[model samples]
Target chain A: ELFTGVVPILVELDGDVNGHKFSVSGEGEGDATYGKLTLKFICTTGKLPVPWPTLVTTLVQCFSRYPDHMKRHDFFKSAMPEGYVQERTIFFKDDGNYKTRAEVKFEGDTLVNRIELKGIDFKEDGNILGHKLEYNYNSHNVYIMADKQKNGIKANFKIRHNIEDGSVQLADHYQQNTPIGDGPVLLPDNHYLSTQSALSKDPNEKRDHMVLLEFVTAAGIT
Target chain B: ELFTGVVPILVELDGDVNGHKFSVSGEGEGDATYGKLTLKFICTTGKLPVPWPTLVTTLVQCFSRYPDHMKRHDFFKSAMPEGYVQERTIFFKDDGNYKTRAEVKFEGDTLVNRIELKGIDFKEDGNILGHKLEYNYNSHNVYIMADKQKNGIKANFKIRHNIEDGSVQLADHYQQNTPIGDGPVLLPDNHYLSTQSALSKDPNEKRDHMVLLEFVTAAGIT
Candidate 1:
């Protein structure tokens, strides 16, 4: 018997404003022994330009095509552009922040999962508000949790908008199987979870709820 | 002179299980002054069912290919045989939320002297995030503002797999323009604005700062 194992990777461009890019990647594993498959996915955002609007506009226009570029575009058209062109100047005094959020999912026989990440860039005012990664996963009998570590990273500080921010924010949530059904589940404050069990009267009719065990875990953000 | 308005709308698929479906709709002044375009894009699970032992296959065999059968053959050769199907039963519980965000730009020989509207989405978590309509006169003077409003409607309920229990949340921030020099001002809360300012200063420097703003409003299970 010839066994085959297949893995899949996917990349998608969700949205971009002022040069900041949002995307996702994932890997899947299949097994011939137990007929099981496991998959992992990640979501990330590209570096932002110093002057977001200028870079963003250029990026958008560059990526924008007449609906036919994908199939027959030349090497030049398919290649990612580089460098920046100097232009006019316009300023506004608004103390607002911008954020980029994304999510990814992967599914196969007996396995299903989803992950999300959000990054916020604040303006001159105080400490920028941001959060770590958060994710949820479930399989044959497993559940997992994950999140980012910090918030508020610095912005570009050049006229050319070439420098990259070094701040390390959570890239995405990572999940693995767990033995205990009850434990501390990571979550933002003002969140909760619950579980229940039930019994059926008919022996033939499948029971609506069976009580093997039930428990709840709660954790809060400070 | 003739005038035109261009608006970019985005629709995201949370999952590829059992073929996901959603809709996008909005009402705006769509007469002779402005033109709007709406497009739909889909992303799906690209891997299929295979024996567990065969999971350690080549990256080319495991990944690379679209979920759609038609696109698979054109991009991938060792493709799964027709009728060799893989079942996907996962729910994207709080996987992530999508918005119908839009941007409006004016194009004409004259100028946008004045503008008005009855209602626009501008509430935190409001079904309508907000709208920005601006007009630029020949003198280079421009006026633009947006309001976020609630949808006052509920999302349709559906069933599947791969859902996280009580794992959904929302984030919101405001943008107020700030004055940097004689050209354009900066918004402490605006990422694009701040980055632009930094880049303008030296074109090679990097800086980090925070901003302040309010939730303004919120709803749903936050």
Candidate 2:
């Protein structure tokens, strides 16, 4: 939501991207209907092998630089190290309101990225997902499950980006005589790709090398 | 306290470990005194260098077979792979009493393990004593830090496992009016070992070629 907004600032990062910090913050006010959101991009380490700062920065630099003054490039456009799960949390109101968190994990074979929206109607108690899109790379599938508890809006669907198959089986335990989205509806899904080639070019062949390391280590089959 | 209990069952594995699942479950009555303490060993994969079941079972077999029908081997006695962070959580009734969780992370250089005990005298509100035992394989040292919220039983000390040294400077915040472990007490630690040679036949050679693979991949320094 905030990704498409105007006037997003790029804060500086002073800490070394060793095990702790990596990433600047971007915040902006959206249209009144969309509300305000703060997007914090995290380039984490400790999961990656040594030279994480170099490896991560080198790979990150291929797509987007830190001084993203215009926010033209998407930080999560490409895949990263298998264990280096990057996160972009679009949270609004630290005092608890409408917010969403998107986690992009390089799960070896697939890119397990999920965006979970919480507190659509000012309810921040339990983790009530307003919308959830889980993209699994192994199966090239995307599982969607969402619910706006206040309005009794619920839906769950599974789709494949590599293929053409999607279904929206909405509302199981919905409120009595709910006005909309009351039942299942099979629909076609778009061809969404979250693989290595989907992002920036192999500029220096680093993606292949990093992915090679990922697969080799991923030799530990489930 | 399941590790210190009597007659804890070693449950069987029902599912073939594919992408996840390991260690199954183990539970039994803790005699008449301790009520029922559940000992659930968990071997969630993707963390280990290889398929955890094979890699784990092969190494675990060297120690004690699950339900070996013999009570001779010490499960917690020996060295493991560099990244094999074994955990044994002894937690009781969720709504009551005390729950102790012991985490042993095989940090290539040091075996960083900590046992956090919640609620000493059956109080399950706050985190009490998080006595962390960091055994540096490089230094052969064990640093212990414990905090008691009851009477504020707080102290810290470092002792070498292979050497002889101790220090004790009782607490200023520790309840002087309260009894029991009053303050910092330096005590000689036993020659405890948690390294690779301690588990196997003390063999000049390491474990399987896969574990050799495990060690090789685990050759990263933080």
Candidate 3:
């Protein structure tokens, strides 16, 4: 028997909260482990002056703005268009050996924000196939706006893999904390609240918009 | 060298038109051929009352309504929101041998709309890795609106794969042609123009909103 560590990240928003959970097991000669991580979230509909009449039009704009130090603040958060409730989830798995690794980084002499892995499988909906996913997080220039000096996170995600044969490439995604005052506030035990919204232009009447992230690691005792 | 046929699909929109091209090469003991199919086209942006402030928001709504028999009629076609010109491409590759197959089908005693492939690779935007892609097109109840019988296309695209060890899944996308009159008109050489827009509510229009698709096959010259 072999022992490995697990890290679970929990995110809370609105009146609803969810967890980024972990389930791991071992296979073969114990050289590697099979692992799956899932993040489930309740999506709130947004306000669109030109409601595009389709989901695609709406999401593209939403994803592009979020995590961008410049544009994310304008990425509004609220209930569904018609006060509807919907559940969405993100899934990642390591089907191969421990060949795939996941790590969290931080800045300063202290920490940075980087997550690296190889040969991991990302789940898709329906009959679609799995693809390898690479993730990167940066904390560059995100803390400058802090009333004091604080830390925010930047993120880069892509799908790519190198096989013995050749190489496979998919897509690239980039994101970062808003440049607004007070980037994501770092809390105790590796927790972060991505937005303080102190300088939000849309600070009109509504619930406070924020994203909270927590990272913790645990190893098997038996 | 064993010979196989190539089918090139060309699509035209706006004043800008493009072709869906094909390239095929062989590998190994003549068992399989490495084939790449690419569809490059200029994407016209849509009008959004609520622009969503990001690419993700706008696209989600646009895609959701596009292939729906009911909603597609309202899916507007025009230049990008700000008259911007963009080139978008879709690419599919078969890295493995002939184990991955591609086919086109039609409806009636004559035809149906189905493209089948196994273990194929779908190219992503950047470092994203390749994954198997499944495509399904349906011609059900699409012809009812036409004064005469005509065909419309419904499309379902997803990412999923089954490995010997286990199965992996990704995402699901569903789409259909507007049930509006004259759906997509069938043309010679397996061509289709998905919308006539007779019932399109946004007939107030700028440019003529239409999509033209042509499918043809040819074998190696030698």
Candidate 4:
């Protein structure tokens, strides 16, 4: 047993989730401290998008313990082009701790919470750093940032938004230190056993009342 | 709004969710205990299910805070009917306190973990008293326990394990007291306003995305 005891978390998915329908999963490891936190999933819509600042606050509550951001996006958006550029800013309210601010400029709907660095074009997920995002904006409908995979060492995950549906699905794709470049190998065998042990641990999974040690094959989060 | 500040949690589900094809979602409320404490999903089986006792240890850790069980199963399975009324037991090793003891007076895989008030259909999900379960026993192949629905309050929701896909699908099905038997009214309108107000309460939701004063429709998780 790797006493280092760094158990990896793997996720595999497909089909109709909370609301949206898709086929995607991820492979990532956690830093023991971070709890592999994500955006905690907020359901939003295009016309009435989450007010920018509140989105950030919700993120703070969720990622309250996240160390720092690897990639940051100071997202900004505008309804329709009016002037040259309006620098809109929000002051961190009341909370004595997170006394900071975020500013997003409007170039019409052009720079609405967006950042283009190197060659990759990225947008802000209400100012999130570690969580992964798969943004795809089309038409007037903004279904851009759903969820996706993230790489690097610090515990990383995806941030899905305006999601029709989403969840903590299968856990069978994480490993640490090294990158399995072509994605990771599928170790169904490894998963099969752990799955049982975990299920065996829950408060239920019985037939009648006798604790059945015979069958066990899965575990966690709805 | 009743804020004993206590929100209960309820779940309904199917198993082997990591790969199970089901649409499920869970609602969460907090008794404010161990934190919807997910059983630190351990990746074990690749080496063979953890030996029973060790399995017990892991479970003990996850349920460390759970009060003593009203019903417990000192789980034991018999391949051979060695004795007539053999009370097969497990000594609480290493882990100090739970060092009490478990004795399963095996009546042929019966009464393993039971509450006398209930029938002889004694089944124990390893000394579990909370959380529902779905267990599937078959083949060298694997069928898992998915999630289930709960009948009580706090946060009522669904479950899916080994879920090839899933979601904490509903948020409007629960009531604080009981008997909404027919159907709970769709308070999307109720939720719609409160959600925005709630989001405003959050400092991280945005970067002046809008101080629109009104129009909420967007709220994240609690």
Candidate 5:
């Protein structure tokens, strides 16, 4: 079904960036808080187009048919020239004392490129740093920025957002703390991680460095 | 605090009347369905005054303070002529194929007396019984009606709605198949039953004929 408007979901994240582990865990359900977390996805269209591949394919087909550059569509990018852009916000709390915010911006139409991880801030245990963590998605590779100085951790790490498999693959550069070359990396196991890691005491332990990111399965807003 | 409006609640029931056991069990949560069950407690005064004793006391106190017999009040019935009457309805489903409903009418001002159980119908499986099962609350004794001939079982059994302890005490008349005397019967342990019994296979077995009945604890409408 297609829908437009704001959808709120409760989500948790768990992972380690070079052995510096962090988790935003709480109750597994509830719209008021993701157990005790809050996240919102704002959609210009009434329904959220998830499984990016499906959305991209549909948008591409529609763009091919429309072939109009003068009109700005809700999702089609080729038809609108600069491509369609959207904003998604995430709020994570470590405890009653520490709260963090991550704002994401990405541009795409047929393929999702130019995905940017912008500012990260500590809303509760206050942080004053303001830097736009710029990263590029080279085909398969996606390097998400770390708050670094503001939050006092070098979280700049390389990860892969595999549109085909709908998973975030961990890059080898994350473990070696090395600079990633060109394009996204493909490890032996793909180093896939799950949302459960975010709730565990060890977000990323001796496991492959993968992370799970998606709309909460139980949030009925969809 | 006091309120005046409507309150909706989800509830389930499990127990045996004589040897015929029945249950309305489901997911244990959700307002849309009690898991998969549907029941509603329509409160005219907005908030449901549960644990009956507190409501009775407050009504009695307020009635004494007002002391009028002409005006029709919402809760204080002694202030008028006839006691205040309320309706509570329950819908139980054994399966997608069978749906049953029970409606209750009770009168009270200071004390909750003249409680009556009326009407049981199988909405889905198709039963055409329309009998007002007239069972009285003789002080401590509350005899709930059974569909009996309509459903093919004589379920007319005696039970207790103990306002003092806020529990439904099982009556010995249920197992013995004997006649209940003048007043309510108090067993050795008061033979209390929990709502879980409604979902269990053996609702009333070697154990006391107790049963649990109350508003669902998680339903926030209260």
Candidate 6:
């Protein structure tokens, strides 16, 4: 018989765009008897200079001109180095749709091992919607009695997208509600487009694009 | 028949403690009716400096130092050149007692001639309340009404003192609400002693005293 306990550990998002690098961390906890878990989702898009350092320096200098941007940079730089890279890239399909792929890694004396997320839909205006997320941990990863010994992980997908313009304009002027995840998920929410092109000509590009990384948990059995 | 008309008038109070001067003139109907009513009130206590110029200069200087005192001087310096000499020196029989006197003289083809108020009781801390006021107007001086002409002028008095102590240790401070007469009459029911002392204090004397002077309406039968 396998005893089950699941605790969420840490969720983080780190990356750079147009030289601006950022890292966000959230808190989670778990116990020894069961497998501890952590999930992270991240997304970003912008033309970065070929050499990452030049791109980062340019972005930092540009953002420094803005007090608010400077504040955010200062806050994130304290947690991580200024050059951490994001592992994945998402793009709009020829049909004007966007896609997202997430991969989760777990290490513990647990019933679960790994999780994979793929095929997240990204809309033409840079909005990400429904996506498939898979888990490969043992049933013991969950604290439930019935699935205690189950070895297969579960898959879950969340659907979210910007219902409005979904363009740079929308990105710049997006307002977000709290309980961070409690509100509708959208790329432009709470973000403003920083690019001159994104803001100048496009009415939808009022605000910047925002990428939210969420840590999803799944149980698996070996 | 008695005709009562409400007209606006300008009352000017000027001068110092020993002897002050005041002039009241009807602004709107100046030529038609000179409406020259002037009365001066004199104080018996604090003597103005000997030379009239010296007294005026010192009083003017005092007025400059304390605007409220200047206002008080201006308000009642009509009937007596040395109006209400004991203003600063006069103390209420009790902690909340006060007194003030003023005379009004109106010379015109109208109704009343002279109005005199004496020993009006004022609450050291309350609003203006008159105690006793004497009125003496020439009855035959009226050219308008003969049959319904009213004779003597008599007004009861109740004085209220709205003096606030603006000093630290009841010794030195700034007086904000200096008492003034000729405005609306305030009731004494809401009077109370101030925890602080008056702003101006006689250096020789250890205590400070200041009072607010407000004029209640003069009631009389002309």
Query: Top TM-score: which candidate number?
Result: 4
Q: What is the lDDT, from 0 to 100, of the residue B149 in candidate 5?
A: 26
lDDT of 5: 0.20
The local lDDT score (0 to 100) that residue B164 gets in candidate 1 is: 33
Writing each residue's lDDT as its tens digit, candidate 1 over A1-222 gives 111233232323343323445543333443322222223323344332222222121111111111221222111112212211111112211222233322222223211222222323334332222111111111111121222131111111111111123121211212221111132322222221121111111123232211111111221212
Q: In model 1, what is the error at residue A144, expressed in angstroms?
A: 41
> What does candidate 4's lDDT look like per residue over A1-222, in tens digits?
110122232222222211323322222232213222121121222121222212221111111111123112101101111211111122221110111121222233221222111101112342212122112100010111211233212111222222123321111111121122334221111111111100011224222111111111111211
lDDT of 6 by residue, B111-186 (tens): 2212111222334333212221111000001011111122111112112222212111111111112222333221
The runs of at least 3 residues in candidate 5 whose Cα sits more than 4 Å from the true structure, single-residue gaps closed, are: A1-222, B1-10, B14-96, B104-222
lDDT of 6 by residue, A11-38 (tens): 4434433334444333334332211122
How many times do residue backbones clash in model 2? 1
Off by over 4 Å in 2: A1-89, A92-222, B1-89, B94-222
TM-score (chain B only), all candidates:
0.15, 0.19, 0.19, 0.17, 0.19, 0.21
What would the per-residue lDDT of candidate 3 be over residues B42-109, giving only the tens digit for each residue? Answer: 23344221101111100101111122233223221211111111111212122221111122121121
- The list of candidate 1 runs beyond 4 A from truth reads A1-66, A69-128, A131-222, B1-219
lDDT of 6: 0.20
- Residue B4 error, candidate 1, Å: 44
Docking level of model 5: incorrect
Number of backbone collisions per candidate? 67, 1, 79, 82, 12, 78
Which DockQ values do the candidates obtain, in the order shown?
0.01, 0.01, 0.01, 0.03, 0.02, 0.01
4 against 5, candidate with superior DockQ: 4
Off by over 4 Å in 4: A1-119, A123-222, B1-222
Query: Which of candidates 2 and 6 is the stronger one according to lDDT?
Result: 2
Between candidates 1 and 4, the one scoring higher on DockQ is 4
Residue A99 in candidate 2 has what lDDT?
28
Give me the candidate number with maximum lDDT.
2
Please list the residue runs of candidate 3 whose C-alpha ends up more than 4 Å from where it truly belongs after superposition. Answer: A1-9, A14-38, A42-148, A151-222, B1-21, B24-148, B151-222
**lDDT digits (tens) for residues A1-222 of candidate 3:** 111222232322221112122221111111011121212222233331110111110010111112223322221111101111112121212222112112222122211112221212323321112222111111111111211122333333332222212233323323333222323332212211221000011113243221111111111111
Q: Candidate 4's C-alpha lDDT?
A: 0.18
Minimal lDDT window, size 10, model 6 chain B: B136-145
* Cα RMSDs, all models: 28.2, 22.7, 23.7, 22.3, 25.0, 32.8
